[PDB]
From a paper:
Resistance nodulation and cell division (RND) efflux pumps are secondary active antiporters that are ubiquitous across all domains of life. As part of tripartite multidrug efflux systems in Gram-negative bacteria, they span the entire cell envelope and export a broad variety of structurally and chemically unrelated toxic substrates.
Further, we reconstituted OqxB in SP-ND to assess its distribution of conformational states in a detergent free environment with cryo-EM. The three individual protomers in the OqxB trimer adopt a highly similar conformation with an all-atom RMSD between the individual chains of ≤ 0.8. However, in all three monomers of OqxB all channels leading to the PD, including the exit tunnel, are very narrow throughout their entire length with a bottleneck radius between 1.1 Å and 1.5 Å. Thus, the cryo-EM structure of OqxB has the typical architecture of the O state, but with a closed exit tunnel and will hereafter be referred to as O*O*O* state. In contrast to the O state observed in the crystallographic TTO structure, the O* state of OqxB has a pronounced shift in the PN1 subdomain, which is likely the reason for the closed configuration of the exit channel. The O* state might represent a local energy minimum in the OqxB structure which leads to the formation of O*O*O* in the absence of a substrate.
Numbering used by the authors:
A (entry chain C): 49 to 336
B (entry chain C): 577 to 720
C (entry chain C): 769 to 912
D (entry chain A): 721 to 816
E (entry chain C): 1009 to 1040
F (entry chain A): 49 to 144
G (entry chain B): 193 to 240
The structure:
C-alpha cells in the first residue's frame, strides 16, 4: 500500500494495523510482517506453511484486505492495495546500461518502465517486476509557491482547476427507441474532454487576470513527465545502470523463469536503440 | 553460491547522496579483491528487507567459478568484511548467501525482538543495543 | 500510449530545502489576501523510528547474524541466544525466530524417533524371517 | 459469415475550451448537460415491491433524434442566462 | 561422503571380527 | 461492465484495455476475447483448457478485475463490474 | 439540541466543523528528490 507523504508511524498506525487485523486468522498462516517506510509505502508479507496452495493463499488474503479496505484512509484507498503471491527474495536481476554513456537517467528508466516491464510481467511464473530506485511513470506538476501566490491563487485552487478541466463524459446516441415512431438510423455520439499531452495540460486555464489575460497552468508550474529525472543510483560494477528485479511466484520453477526472462530479453534486444545493452550478471539459478 | 551479500547502514538522517558515496567505495573494494567477478550496487535499498531506506544500501558481489580462484567464499567474505570495516562514514557488512534459496536473506540466525508489553520504541531500541553488545561479547560470533 | 497514468501536484524541490521554506508558504485568509503560514504553525525537532517494523501484530526489531562454524554451530548459537533473551530482555518483550531459524527451532528431535523405530523394525523383520529372538541381536548389535 | 463491420456512423462532439471560456459557460455545466440530456443519467434508487430499482433521467426521444437537437441544448452561463450549446461544441460525424 | 565412507570403513573392519563373535556367543548362551 | 452512452471505441480503450491488462496471465488460460457494443456494455470472456476447475478460475479473474478497479472511470465504478463463471451458449429458452 | 439551537447552529453545522478540524495531513520530507543538487540531509515532516 502507498500513503504519499506520510511518516512511517502514521502508516503503521492507520494502515498496517487495520490490514493486520483483517489478515489474522487466515488458514495455514505461519507468521506475518509489516514494514512501513518514510517513502510512504507499506509492505506486508504473509508467510504460509509449506505445501499450502499459493493461489488459495492469495485469494484468501486479498479478500481479507478488501474487508479492511473501508477502514483505510481515502488517499490510501484511492491508489489501491495490491496483493500478489511473490517470493520475498530476488530470483534474477536484469541490467540495462549504456556502454559509452550515450543516454541519461531519464531515458533508460523510462525505457525500462514503458517497454521492458510489461513484456516481462506477461511471462509465466513471474510474481513481480520492480525497477530499483525508479518511480512510477506519471504526470508530475511541480508548483512554484511564490508564482502561485503572486498570481492570486492557492494550492487548492490549482488542484481543483485541473480536476474539473480533465473529465470524461458519455453522450449517448441519436434516434433512440423512446421515439413515438420507429427511427431509421442509430448513430452513437462521442463527447471528449480528456487531455493527453504536456502542452494540453500546460493550457489548463486557472484564472482570468485583471488585465484580461488567461492564466494557464504552465505560467506557475514546471510541468514534467516521466518516471523521475533524478540521477541514476543503481550501479553495475561501478558504472551506471538500471537494475530490473524479478521475483518468482511461489511454486514456479526457478530454472524455467530464468530461461524465459533471458529468452524474452534477447528478443527485446533486437529493437534496442544504438549503444543500448543488457546483461544479467546476478542469477542464482545458474548455480542451481 | 558464487555470490555474496553486502550492505551499509549510514547514521540516521543521512541523505541518499551520502549513502551512495560509501556504496561506491564498497563496490571498489569488492572488485579489487581477487576472486570477485562483479559488483551490483543498489544504494537506498535495504539488504535485510528489500525496502527503500535513504541511509541503507545493498551490494551483491559476484564470484568467479570455483576453479578460477584459490580462495573459498568464506575466505573472500572475511577479507572483504575486514576491508570494509575501515570505512568510518557508516557501518558496513557482508554475509554469505542463505543455504536454501528463497528462504531467508542470508546465512546465520534470524530473529525479531517483539514488544508485547507496550514499552515503546525507546525501550525496544535499548534492547537491540543490549542484545548486540552481548552477542559481540560471546566468542565465535560476529556483530549482528 | 494506450495506457493510463496518474497526475500529481507538489511544490518544486528547491522550495522545500529548509524549515524557512515551510514558514514561507502562503494561504488565503477570509479577507482575501495571502499571508505566510509561519505565523500560525510551530516547527520543532522530534525523533522517531524509520522504518517501523511490526512482526505478528506487535512492534518488533529484526536481528541477523552469523557465527564461526569452527567455534560455534548453528544449534549452539540458537541455544545461546535464547538464554540471553531471558537474561537481558525485560518483561513483556521476547524474541521470535524467522526464516530458516524458525524451521530449525520448529523441528522436533527428528533423529530421536526414526533411529530407534527403524532399528526396531529391522529387528522384528529379521526375527520373522530367521525364526529367532537372539539371531537378529547378532545383526543389530553392529549398528552402534 | 462475419459480424464485423467498420462503417458504422458515429458523432464526435468536441468541446472548444477557449471558446467556452469566452462564452462564459463552465465546462462542468457544459459536460453535465450532455451527460444528462443525451446520455442516461443515474440519479438514485427507489423501492417498489420490496425491491430496489434505479431512477434514470434522460431527454425524451423526439428531442434526441438530430444534430440540430444537440446544438439546441441550452446551458447556464456566468450571467445566469440560457444559451444554446451549439456555439461551443464542434459536432462532426465519424465512422468506426 | 565423509559420513558414509568413514562408517563403511569402520563397519567392514568391525563387522568381520565382531559378527562371528556375536553369533557364537548368543548361540552358546541359548544352548546353555 | 457497463458504460451508458460511451461508444465502443472508448470502452475498448479505458475499460476493456485496463481489464485485459490485469486479466492476462492466469494459469491454464487458452485464449480470451472482449466485445464492446454500441449499447455501452462490455463483455470479456476468458477460456481455459479443458479439465480446469471453474470455481478456482472464477475467483481469480474477479480478483484481477478488483486489482484494476481504480483505473476505471467513476461512472463505470458506480455501476459495478460483474464477474461470473458462465457458459457462452444457451442451454434452454422459456417463452412467455 | 436546545444549546445548539441557542447559538444559531444546526446539526449539519456542527458535523461539518468536526470533520474539517480533525483531518490527517501528510507533509512529506525536506530536501527531497527533485532538487537540482545533492542534499546533505533528508528529514521527514510530521504535520498533525
Amino acid at each position: 500500500a502507498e500513503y504519499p507523504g506520510a511518516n512511517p508511524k502514521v502508516i503503521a498506525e492507520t494502515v498496517a494495523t487495520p490490514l493486520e487485523e483483517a489478515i489474522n486468522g487466515v488458514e495455514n498462516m505461519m507468521y506475518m510482517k509489516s514494514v512501513a517506510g518514510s517513502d510512504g509505502v507499506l509492505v506486508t508479507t504473509v508467510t504460509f506453511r509449506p505445501g499450502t496452495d499459493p493461489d488459495q493463499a492469495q485469494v484468501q488474503v486479498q479478500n481479507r484486505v478488501a474487508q479492511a479496505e473501508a477502514r483505510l484512509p481515502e488517499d490510501v484507498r484511492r491508489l489501491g492495495i495490491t496483493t500478489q503471491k511473490q517470493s520475498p527474495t530476488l530470483t534474477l536481476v536484469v541490467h540495462l546500461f549504456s556502454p559509452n554513456g550515450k543516454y541519461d537517467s531519464l531515458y533508460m528508466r523510462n525505457y525500462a518502465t514503458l517497454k521492458v516491464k510489461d513484456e516481462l510481467a506477461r511471462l509465466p511464473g513471474v510474481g513481480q517486476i520492480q525497477i530499483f530506485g525508479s518511480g512510477e511513470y506519471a504526470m508530475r506538476v511541480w508548483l512554484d509557491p511564490n508564482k502561485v501566490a503572486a498570481r492570486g491563487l492557492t494550492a487548492s485552487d490549482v488542484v481543483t482547476a485541473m480536476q474539473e478541466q480533465n473529465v470524461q463524459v458519455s453522450a449517448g446516441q441519436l434516434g433512440a427507441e423512446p421515439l413515438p415512431q420507429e427511427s431509421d438510423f442509430l448513430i452513437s455520439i462521442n463527447a471528449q474532454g480528456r487531455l493527453h499531452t504536456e502542452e494540453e495540460f500546460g493550457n489548463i486555464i486557472l484564472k482570468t487576470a485583471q488585465d484580461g489575460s488567461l492564466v494557464r497552468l504552465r505560467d506557475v508550474a514546471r510541468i514534467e513527465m516521466g518516471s523521475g529525472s533524478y540521477a541514476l543510483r543503481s550501479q553495475l560494477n561501478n558504472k551506471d545502470a538500471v537494475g530490473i528485479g524479478i521475483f518468482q511466484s511461489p511454486g514456479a520453477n526457478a530454472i524455467d523463469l530464468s530461461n524465459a526472462v533471458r529468452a524474452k530479453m534477447a528478443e527485446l534486444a533486437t529493437r534496442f536503440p544504438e549503444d543500448m545493452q543488457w546483461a544479467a550478471p546476478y542469477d542464482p539459478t545458474v548455480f542451481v | 553460491k558464487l555470490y555474496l551479500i553486502g550492505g551499509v547502514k549510514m547514521p540516521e538522517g543521512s541523505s541518499l547522496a551520502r549513502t551512495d558515496a560509501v556504496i561506491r567505495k564498497m563496490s571498489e573494494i569488492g572488485m579489487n579483491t581477487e576472486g570477485v567477478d562483479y559488483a551490483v550496487a543498489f544504494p537506498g535499498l535495504n539488504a535485510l528487507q528489500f525496502t527503500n531506506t535513504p541511509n541503507t544500501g545493498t551490494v551483491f558481489f559476484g564470484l568467479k567459478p570455483f576453479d578460477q580462484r584459490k580462495h573459498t567464499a568464506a575466505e573472500i567474505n572475511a577479507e572483504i568484511n575486514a576491508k570494509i570495516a575501515q570505512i568510518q562514514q557508516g557501518f558496513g557488512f557482508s554475509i554469505l548467501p542463505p543455504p536454501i534459496l528463497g528462504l531467508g536473506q542470508g546465512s546465520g540466525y534470524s530473529l525479531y525482538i517483539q514488544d508485547r508489553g507496550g514499552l515503546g520504541y525507546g525501550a525496544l531500541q535499548s534492547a537491540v543495543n543490549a542484545m548486540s553488545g552481548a552477542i559481540m561479547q560471546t566468542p565465535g560470533m560476529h556483530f549482528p | 500510449f494506450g495506457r493510463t497514468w496518474r497526475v500529481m501536484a507538489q511544490a518544486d524541490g528547491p522550495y522545500r530545502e529548509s524549515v524557512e521554506d515551510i514558514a514561507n508558504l502562503r494561504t488565503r485568509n477570509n479577507q482575501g489576501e495571502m499571508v505566510p503560514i509561519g505565523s500560525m504553525v510551530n516547527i520543532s525537532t522530534t525523533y522517531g523510528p524509520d522504518p517501523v517494523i511490526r512482526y505478528n501484530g506487535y512492534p518488533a526489531a529484526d536481528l541477523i547474524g552469523d557465527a564461526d562454524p569452527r567455534v560455534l554451530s548453528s544449534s549452539q548459537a540458537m541455544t545461546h541466544l535464547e538464554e540471553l533473551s531471558k537474561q537481558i530482555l525485560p518483561n513483556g518483550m521476547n524474541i521470535e525466530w524467522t526464516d530458516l531459524s524458525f524451521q530449525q527451532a520448529t523441528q522436533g528431535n527428528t533423529a530421536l524417533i526414526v533411529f530407534p523405530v527403524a532399528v526396531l523394525l529391522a529387528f522384528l523383520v529379521l526375527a520373522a524371517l530367521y525364526e529367532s529372538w537372539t539371531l537378529p541381536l547378532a545383526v543389530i548389535l553392529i549398528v552402534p | 459469415i462475419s459480424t464485423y463491420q467498420a462503417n458504422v456512423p458515429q458523432l464526435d462532439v468536441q468541446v472548444d475550451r477557449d471558446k467556452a471560456k469566452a462564452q462564459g459557460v463552465s465546462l462542468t455545466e457544459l459536460f453535465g448537460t450532455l451527460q444528462t440530456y443525451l446520455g442516461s443519467s443515474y440519479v438514485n434508487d427507489f423501492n417498489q415491491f420490496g425491491r430496489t430499482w434505479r431512477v434514470m433521467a434522460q431527454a425524451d426521444g423526439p428531442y434526441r433524434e438530430s444534430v440540430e437537437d444537440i446544438a439546441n441544448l441550452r446551458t447556464r452561463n456566468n450571467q445566469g442566462e440560457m444559451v444554446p450549446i451549439g456555439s461551443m461544441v464542434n459536432i462532426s460525424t465519424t465512422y468506426g | 561422503g565423509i559420513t558414509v565412507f568413514s562408517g563403511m570403513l569402520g563397519v567392514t573392519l568391525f563387522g568381520l571380527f565382531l559378527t562371528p563373535v556375536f553369533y557364537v556367543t548368543l548361540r552358546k548362551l541359548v544352548t546353555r
